[PDB]
Amino acid sequence: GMDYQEYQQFLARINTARDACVAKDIDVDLLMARHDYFGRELCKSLNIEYRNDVPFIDIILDIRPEVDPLTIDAPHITPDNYLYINNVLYIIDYKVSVSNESSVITYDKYYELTRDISDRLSIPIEIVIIRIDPVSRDLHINSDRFKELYPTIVVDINFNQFFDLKQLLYEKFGDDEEFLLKVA
Ligand SMILES: O=C(O)/C(O)=C/C(=O)C1(Cc2ccc(Cl)cc2)CCN(Cc2ccccc2)CC1
Ligand SMILES: [Mn+2]
Ligand SMILES: [Mn+2]
């Protein structure tokens, strides 16, 4: 799980919180903490360097350092990570959700915006959304091409801290109508 230190910060914030706006910022900070936690552990399993929200321009500069970043016609996306093997660019994104609705929105965005640049660099760009179901703890990965490189991937983590902290937050603001009907 997260460091004792990070769990303490959430515990302190949840207990000090008197107001729905503060409460929702914790709710959102937990989802993001959980996403980043899966990110770090996933990157250990894949044995690739851990990254977050990498500017696409930097990814291009890394795999093709001759490219002038002032002129290249590149999309403005910040994918969580990426892998370049056998002249194939895998654009990786971490997801922690029980559904694919977010996965699809990200895949649709990243797929559409990377068709042009793939054609220009003559490098096939494979969009890999690596999602863990936080309940079942099962890995769902869309890209068949990516799953050939990494045929069996055990992460073996859990989100019981995240579930507890969230539950404590919904317990505390359970009769705050404004908290229960506020969005990210
Ligand atoms: O949902 C994800 O899996 C994910 O990684 C998203 C993000 O990283 C952004 C921040 C974020 C939001 C929510 C979560 Cl759970 C984790 C991170 C939101 C979309 N991003 C929008 C954006 C795109 C391009 C340029 C600026 C901002 C900002 C970062
Ligand atoms: Mn991201
Ligand atoms: Mn992500």
Side-chain angles (χ1 to χ4, degrees):
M2 64 213 308
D3 295 350
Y4 294 164
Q5 180 196 51
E6 214 207 332
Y7 186 96
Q8 281 321 321
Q9 267 140 32
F10 278 116
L11 206 57
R13 285 175 64 190
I14 290 167
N15 285 85
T16 195
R18 292 276 160 283
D19 294 274
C21 66
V22 180
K24 188 54 51 173
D25 275 354
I26 299 156
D27 209 358
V28 176
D29 279 3
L30 274 175
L31 286 178
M32 291 183 60
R34 189 178 71 167
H35 166 276
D36 298 332
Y37 166 54
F38 171 58
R40 288 188 308 271
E41 288 311 313
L42 170 68
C43 284
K44 278 161 200 175
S45 299
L46 299 176
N47 197 71
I48 66 180
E49 196 195 316
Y50 173 72
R51 303 207 189 76
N52 200 226
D53 301 344
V54 181
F56 200 75
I57 187 51
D58 297 336
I59 300 173
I60 292 170
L61 276 190
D62 183 35
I63 71 173
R64 284 260 199 287
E66 83 278 8
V67 167
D68 175 9
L70 299 164
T71 63
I72 185 68
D73 183 33
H76 173 46
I77 54 166
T78 55
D80 293 331
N81 213 329
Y82 72 98
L83 218 196
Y84 181 62
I85 331 181
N86 314 126
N87 197 62
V88 181
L89 177 56
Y90 298 88
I91 301 303
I92 299 156
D93 167 69
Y94 325 135
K95 275 295 179 307
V96 188
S97 159
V98 287
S99 104
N100 64 4
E101 283 167 307
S102 51
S103 303
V104 172
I105 289 164
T106 316
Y107 175 86
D108 281 359
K109 189 174 53 141
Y110 284 13
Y111 182 74
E112 288 175 31
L113 297 184
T114 49
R115 288 318 87 200
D116 205 30
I117 193 66
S118 176
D119 292 327
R120 294 174 169 282
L121 297 168
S122 267
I123 298 177
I125 295 185
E126 194 81 16
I127 304 301
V128 185
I129 282 74
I130 305 169
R131 169 178 132 247
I132 193 171
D133 188 298
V135 175
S136 61
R137 317 246 243 70
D138 290 324
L139 275 185
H140 314 298
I141 305 170
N142 58 310
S143 185
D144 301 297
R145 203 172 187 170
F146 182 79
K147 282 185 291 191
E148 262 149 41
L149 279 43
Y150 297 85
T152 21
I153 314 171
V154 303
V155 165
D156 180 29
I157 67 182
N158 72 288
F159 309 103
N160 282 339
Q161 298 174 315
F162 295 102
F163 285 128
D164 289 346
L165 285 174
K166 191 205 192 170
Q167 184 167 328
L168 173 67
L169 183 62
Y170 272 81
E171 169 90 318
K172 220 211 161 175
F173 293 89
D175 305 304
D176 190 336
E177 175 151 21
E178 300 210 354
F179 170 67
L180 297 182
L181 290 178
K182 198 183 292 287
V183 251

mmCIF file of all heavy atoms in Angstrom, residues 28 30-36 52-53 76-80 93-96 102 106 109-110, ligand 1:
data_model
loop_
_atom_site.group_PDB
_atom_site.id
_atom_site.type_symbol
_atom_site.label_atom_id
_atom_site.label_comp_id
_atom_site.label_asym_id
_atom_site.label_seq_id
_atom_site.Cartn_x
_atom_site.Cartn_y
_atom_site.Cartn_z
ATOM 1 N N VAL A 28 -11.044 13.027 -4.491
ATOM 2 C CA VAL A 28 -10.336 13.124 -5.799
ATOM 3 C C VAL A 28 -8.861 12.777 -5.565
ATOM 4 O O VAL A 28 -8.306 12.003 -6.368
ATOM 5 C CB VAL A 28 -10.531 14.517 -6.433
ATOM 6 C CG1 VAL A 28 -9.731 14.677 -7.718
ATOM 7 C CG2 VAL A 28 -12.002 14.816 -6.684
ATOM 8 N N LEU A 30 -7.583 10.878 -3.370
ATOM 9 C CA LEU A 30 -7.510 9.416 -3.108
ATOM 10 C C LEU A 30 -7.496 8.653 -4.436
ATOM 11 O O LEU A 30 -6.637 7.754 -4.584
ATOM 12 C CB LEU A 30 -8.699 8.989 -2.244
ATOM 13 C CG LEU A 30 -8.506 9.132 -0.737
ATOM 14 C CD1 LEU A 30 -9.796 8.786 -0.004
ATOM 15 C CD2 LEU A 30 -7.358 8.259 -0.244
ATOM 16 N N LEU A 31 -8.411 8.981 -5.357
ATOM 17 C CA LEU A 31 -8.487 8.327 -6.695
ATOM 18 C C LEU A 31 -7.143 8.492 -7.407
ATOM 19 O O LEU A 31 -6.682 7.509 -8.022
ATOM 20 C CB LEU A 31 -9.628 8.922 -7.526
ATOM 21 C CG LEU A 31 -11.030 8.491 -7.099
ATOM 22 C CD1 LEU A 31 -12.096 9.170 -7.948
ATOM 23 C CD2 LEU A 31 -11.179 6.974 -7.161
ATOM 24 N N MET A 32 -6.535 9.676 -7.293
ATOM 25 C CA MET A 32 -5.258 10.034 -7.964
ATOM 26 C C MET A 32 -4.093 9.326 -7.267
ATOM 27 O O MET A 32 -3.218 8.813 -7.981
ATOM 28 C CB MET A 32 -5.036 11.547 -7.945
ATOM 29 C CG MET A 32 -6.004 12.307 -8.836
ATOM 30 S SD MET A 32 -5.671 14.095 -8.877
ATOM 31 C CE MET A 32 -3.995 14.084 -9.514
ATOM 32 N N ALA A 33 -4.083 9.309 -5.934
ATOM 33 C CA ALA A 33 -3.098 8.570 -5.105
ATOM 34 C C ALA A 33 -3.116 7.084 -5.489
ATOM 35 O O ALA A 33 -2.031 6.494 -5.670
ATOM 36 C CB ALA A 33 -3.410 8.760 -3.639
ATOM 37 N N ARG A 34 -4.319 6.517 -5.621
ATOM 38 C CA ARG A 34 -4.567 5.091 -5.957
ATOM 39 C C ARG A 34 -4.055 4.789 -7.368
ATOM 40 O O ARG A 34 -3.434 3.729 -7.556
ATOM 41 C CB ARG A 34 -6.067 4.792 -5.861
ATOM 42 C CG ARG A 34 -6.410 3.315 -5.983
ATOM 43 C CD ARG A 34 -7.892 3.061 -5.834
ATOM 44 N NE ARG A 34 -8.643 3.549 -6.980
ATOM 45 C CZ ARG A 34 -9.912 3.257 -7.233
ATOM 46 N NH1 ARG A 34 -10.601 2.472 -6.422
ATOM 47 N NH2 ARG A 34 -10.492 3.745 -8.310
ATOM 48 N N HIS A 35 -4.361 5.667 -8.327
ATOM 49 C CA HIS A 35 -3.895 5.599 -9.737
ATOM 50 C C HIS A 35 -2.365 5.559 -9.750
ATOM 51 O O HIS A 35 -1.803 4.645 -10.383
ATOM 52 C CB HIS A 35 -4.459 6.782 -10.538
ATOM 53 C CG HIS A 35 -3.812 6.999 -11.864
ATOM 54 N ND1 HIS A 35 -2.635 7.711 -12.003
ATOM 55 C CD2 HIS A 35 -4.177 6.622 -13.108
ATOM 56 C CE1 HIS A 35 -2.298 7.756 -13.275
ATOM 57 N NE2 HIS A 35 -3.231 7.102 -13.974
ATOM 58 N N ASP A 36 -1.734 6.510 -9.057
ATOM 59 C CA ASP A 36 -0.258 6.674 -9.006
ATOM 60 C C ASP A 36 0.362 5.458 -8.303
ATOM 61 O O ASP A 36 1.418 4.991 -8.769
ATOM 62 C CB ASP A 36 0.119 8.009 -8.360
ATOM 63 C CG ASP A 36 -0.376 9.231 -9.124
ATOM 64 O OD1 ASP A 36 -0.532 9.145 -10.369
ATOM 65 O OD2 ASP A 36 -0.608 10.267 -8.469
ATOM 66 N N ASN A 52 5.182 9.613 -15.030
ATOM 67 C CA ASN A 52 3.791 10.131 -14.960
ATOM 68 C C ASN A 52 3.664 11.260 -15.984
ATOM 69 O O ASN A 52 4.669 11.948 -16.230
ATOM 70 C CB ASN A 52 3.404 10.572 -13.544
ATOM 71 C CG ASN A 52 1.905 10.640 -13.325
ATOM 72 O OD1 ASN A 52 1.389 11.605 -12.762
ATOM 73 N ND2 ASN A 52 1.187 9.618 -13.759
ATOM 74 N N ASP A 53 2.476 11.396 -16.574
ATOM 75 C CA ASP A 53 2.086 12.500 -17.490
ATOM 76 C C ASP A 53 3.326 13.040 -18.221
ATOM 77 O O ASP A 53 3.709 14.191 -17.959
ATOM 78 C CB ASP A 53 1.310 13.571 -16.710
ATOM 79 C CG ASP A 53 0.049 13.046 -16.037
ATOM 80 O OD1 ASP A 53 -0.395 11.940 -16.417
ATOM 81 O OD2 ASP A 53 -0.477 13.737 -15.128
ATOM 82 N N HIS A 76 -0.717 17.224 -28.352
ATOM 83 C CA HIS A 76 -0.556 17.735 -26.965
ATOM 84 C C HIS A 76 -1.333 16.804 -26.027
ATOM 85 O O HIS A 76 -2.426 17.186 -25.553
ATOM 86 C CB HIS A 76 -0.955 19.222 -26.885
ATOM 87 C CG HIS A 76 -0.979 19.784 -25.500
ATOM 88 N ND1 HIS A 76 0.046 19.562 -24.587
ATOM 89 C CD2 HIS A 76 -1.893 20.556 -24.870
ATOM 90 C CE1 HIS A 76 -0.245 20.163 -23.451
ATOM 91 N NE2 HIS A 76 -1.432 20.782 -23.601
ATOM 92 N N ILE A 77 -0.786 15.605 -25.819
ATOM 93 C CA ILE A 77 -1.244 14.605 -24.809
ATOM 94 C C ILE A 77 -0.089 14.381 -23.828
ATOM 95 O O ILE A 77 1.070 14.645 -24.208
ATOM 96 C CB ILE A 77 -1.703 13.290 -25.478
ATOM 97 C CG1 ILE A 77 -0.631 12.703 -26.401
ATOM 98 C CG2 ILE A 77 -3.018 13.485 -26.211
ATOM 99 C CD1 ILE A 77 -0.895 11.275 -26.815
ATOM 100 N N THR A 78 -0.403 13.932 -22.613
ATOM 101 C CA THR A 78 0.579 13.627 -21.539
ATOM 102 C C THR A 78 0.296 12.223 -21.021
ATOM 103 O O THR A 78 -0.273 12.061 -19.938
ATOM 104 C CB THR A 78 0.543 14.698 -20.443
ATOM 105 O OG1 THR A 78 -0.798 14.805 -19.960
ATOM 106 C CG2 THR A 78 1.018 16.043 -20.941
ATOM 107 N N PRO A 79 0.644 11.171 -21.803
ATOM 108 C CA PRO A 79 0.457 9.787 -21.368
ATOM 109 C C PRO A 79 1.326 9.449 -20.151
ATOM 110 O O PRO A 79 2.419 9.965 -20.033
ATOM 111 C CB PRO A 79 0.878 8.952 -22.586
ATOM 112 C CG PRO A 79 1.816 9.864 -23.345
ATOM 113 C CD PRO A 79 1.233 11.249 -23.150
ATOM 114 N N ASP A 80 0.815 8.575 -19.287
ATOM 115 C CA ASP A 80 1.448 8.203 -17.997
ATOM 116 C C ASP A 80 2.859 7.655 -18.249
ATOM 117 O O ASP A 80 3.771 7.955 -17.441
ATOM 118 C CB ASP A 80 0.563 7.217 -17.235
ATOM 119 C CG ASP A 80 -0.743 7.834 -16.773
ATOM 120 O OD1 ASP A 80 -0.757 9.066 -16.541
ATOM 121 O OD2 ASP A 80 -1.735 7.086 -16.658
ATOM 122 N N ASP A 93 -0.956 4.018 -20.537
ATOM 123 C CA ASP A 93 -1.753 4.794 -19.557
ATOM 124 C C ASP A 93 -2.220 3.847 -18.445
ATOM 125 O O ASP A 93 -2.739 2.764 -18.768
ATOM 126 C CB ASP A 93 -2.936 5.486 -20.228
ATOM 127 C CG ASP A 93 -3.937 6.015 -19.217
ATOM 128 O OD1 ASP A 93 -3.584 6.975 -18.504
ATOM 129 O OD2 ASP A 93 -5.048 5.431 -19.125
ATOM 130 N N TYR A 94 -2.034 4.253 -17.188
ATOM 131 C CA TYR A 94 -2.504 3.524 -15.984
ATOM 132 C C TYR A 94 -3.981 3.874 -15.754
ATOM 133 O O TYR A 94 -4.355 5.052 -15.904
ATOM 134 C CB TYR A 94 -1.680 3.883 -14.741
ATOM 135 C CG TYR A 94 -0.202 4.156 -14.929
ATOM 136 C CD1 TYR A 94 0.388 5.247 -14.308
ATOM 137 C CD2 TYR A 94 0.617 3.311 -15.663
ATOM 138 C CE1 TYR A 94 1.741 5.511 -14.431
ATOM 139 C CE2 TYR A 94 1.974 3.564 -15.801
ATOM 140 C CZ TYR A 94 2.538 4.668 -15.181
ATOM 141 O OH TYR A 94 3.870 4.947 -15.290
ATOM 142 N N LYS A 95 -4.799 2.878 -15.409
ATOM 143 C CA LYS A 95 -6.224 3.060 -15.022
ATOM 144 C C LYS A 95 -6.517 2.166 -13.820
ATOM 145 O O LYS A 95 -6.021 1.021 -13.808
ATOM 146 C CB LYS A 95 -7.181 2.706 -16.165
ATOM 147 C CG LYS A 95 -7.442 3.821 -17.168
ATOM 148 C CD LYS A 95 -8.171 5.016 -16.576
ATOM 149 C CE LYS A 95 -8.403 6.130 -17.574
ATOM 150 N NZ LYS A 95 -7.147 6.532 -18.249
ATOM 151 N N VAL A 96 -7.264 2.693 -12.846
ATOM 152 C CA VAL A 96 -7.839 1.911 -11.715
ATOM 153 C C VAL A 96 -9.338 2.212 -11.670
ATOM 154 O O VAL A 96 -9.720 3.279 -11.169
ATOM 155 C CB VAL A 96 -7.146 2.211 -10.374
ATOM 156 C CG1 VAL A 96 -7.622 1.254 -9.291
ATOM 157 C CG2 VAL A 96 -5.629 2.172 -10.493
ATOM 158 N N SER A 102 -13.739 5.154 -18.725
ATOM 159 C CA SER A 102 -12.565 6.063 -18.725
ATOM 160 C C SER A 102 -11.516 5.542 -19.712
ATOM 161 O O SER A 102 -11.016 6.354 -20.509
ATOM 162 C CB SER A 102 -11.989 6.238 -17.344
ATOM 163 O OG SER A 102 -11.752 4.985 -16.727
ATOM 164 N N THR A 106 -9.970 7.637 -23.003
ATOM 165 C CA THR A 106 -8.499 7.842 -23.129
ATOM 166 C C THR A 106 -7.989 7.169 -24.405
ATOM 167 O O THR A 106 -7.198 7.807 -25.120
ATOM 168 C CB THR A 106 -7.708 7.276 -21.942
ATOM 169 O OG1 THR A 106 -8.356 7.631 -20.725
ATOM 170 C CG2 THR A 106 -6.279 7.770 -21.907
ATOM 171 N N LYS A 109 -9.152 9.122 -27.435
ATOM 172 C CA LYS A 109 -8.391 10.396 -27.528
ATOM 173 C C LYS A 109 -7.000 10.101 -28.107
ATOM 174 O O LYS A 109 -6.643 10.715 -29.135
ATOM 175 C CB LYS A 109 -8.310 11.097 -26.165
ATOM 176 C CG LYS A 109 -7.737 12.513 -26.194
ATOM 177 C CD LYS A 109 -7.783 13.264 -24.863
ATOM 178 C CE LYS A 109 -7.166 12.499 -23.700
ATOM 179 N NZ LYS A 109 -6.397 13.369 -22.771
ATOM 180 N N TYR A 110 -6.257 9.178 -27.487
ATOM 181 C CA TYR A 110 -4.821 8.904 -27.774
ATOM 182 C C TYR A 110 -4.681 8.291 -29.170
ATOM 183 O O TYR A 110 -3.734 8.663 -29.886
ATOM 184 C CB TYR A 110 -4.205 7.990 -26.709
ATOM 185 C CG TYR A 110 -3.875 8.646 -25.391
ATOM 186 C CD1 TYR A 110 -4.345 9.911 -25.069
ATOM 187 C CD2 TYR A 110 -3.124 7.979 -24.437
ATOM 188 C CE1 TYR A 110 -4.059 10.501 -23.849
ATOM 189 C CE2 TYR A 110 -2.830 8.554 -23.210
ATOM 190 C CZ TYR A 110 -3.296 9.823 -22.917
ATOM 191 O OH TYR A 110 -3.016 10.416 -21.724
HETATM 192 O O1 LIG B 1 -7.294 9.260 -15.990
HETATM 193 C C1 LIG B 1 -6.124 8.908 -16.098
HETATM 194 O O2 LIG B 1 -5.769 7.731 -16.197
HETATM 195 C C2 LIG B 1 -5.071 9.984 -16.103
HETATM 196 O O3 LIG B 1 -3.907 9.609 -16.008
HETATM 197 C C3 LIG B 1 -5.335 11.354 -16.188
HETATM 198 C C4 LIG B 1 -4.410 12.415 -15.802
HETATM 199 O O4 LIG B 1 -3.231 12.117 -15.660
HETATM 200 C C5 LIG B 1 -4.824 13.864 -15.489
HETATM 201 C C6 LIG B 1 -4.764 14.016 -13.954
HETATM 202 C C7 LIG B 1 -5.430 12.871 -13.235
HETATM 203 C C8 LIG B 1 -6.788 12.898 -12.953
HETATM 204 C C9 LIG B 1 -7.407 11.843 -12.316
HETATM 205 C C10 LIG B 1 -6.659 10.745 -11.970
HETATM 206 CL CL1 LIG B 1 -7.433 9.412 -11.170
HETATM 207 C C11 LIG B 1 -5.314 10.677 -12.233
HETATM 208 C C12 LIG B 1 -4.707 11.744 -12.862
HETATM 209 C C13 LIG B 1 -6.227 14.203 -16.017
HETATM 210 C C14 LIG B 1 -6.286 14.312 -17.531
HETATM 211 N N1 LIG B 1 -5.231 15.165 -18.095
HETATM 212 C C15 LIG B 1 -5.788 16.156 -19.028
HETATM 213 C C16 LIG B 1 -4.754 16.864 -19.876
HETATM 214 C C17 LIG B 1 -4.380 16.354 -21.112
HETATM 215 C C18 LIG B 1 -3.440 17.009 -21.894
HETATM 216 C C19 LIG B 1 -2.867 18.180 -21.449
HETATM 217 C C20 LIG B 1 -3.229 18.702 -20.227
HETATM 218 C C21 LIG B 1 -4.174 18.052 -19.448
HETATM 219 C C22 LIG B 1 -4.459 15.819 -17.035
HETATM 220 C C23 LIG B 1 -3.792 14.788 -16.151
#
